[PDB]
């Protein structure tokens, strides 16, 4: 029953900046079984990262991820207007899956 926590519950930045978001898990996930989602207000969440550091079709190259044991990081470079809202953090190594508390950006 892995519980994941995100430290920077609130963040602020300007266009062109770089943002780091961190997730900590109660157990080490050696398989990098972590996903990163984005949710704008009034819309469904969108999946951006899976397996810690893998992008999807259409997701900009600006987004990046790093994974190591219990510490997972999402890095956003050259922040634009569209990259606003709540970022969510999920594990799927154990059952059931569990989401983070989300970090607000912009």
């Amino acid at each position: 029953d892995i519980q994941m926590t995100q430290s920077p519950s609130t963040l602020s930045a300007s266009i062109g900046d770089t943002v780091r978001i961190s997730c900590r898990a109660s157990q080490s996930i050696t398989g990098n079984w972590v996903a990163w989602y984005q949710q704008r207000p009034g819309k469904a969440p969108r999946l951006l990262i899976y397996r810690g550091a893998a992008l999807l079709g259409g997701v900009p190259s600006r987004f990046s991820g790093s994974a190591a044991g219990t510490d997972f990081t999402l890095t956003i470079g050259n922040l634009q207007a569209e990259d606003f809202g709540t970022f969510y953090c999920q594990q799927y190594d154990t059952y059931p899956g569990t989401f983070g508390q989300g970090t607000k950006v912009e």
Partner: peptide, 17 residues
């Protein structure tokens, strides 16, 4: 694929809710 691990999975596509 890295989108699933023996039943417990990621969510690639979402509905409007």
């Amino acid at each position: 694929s890295g989108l699933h691990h023996d039943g417990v999975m990621a969510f690639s596509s979402w509905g409007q809710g």
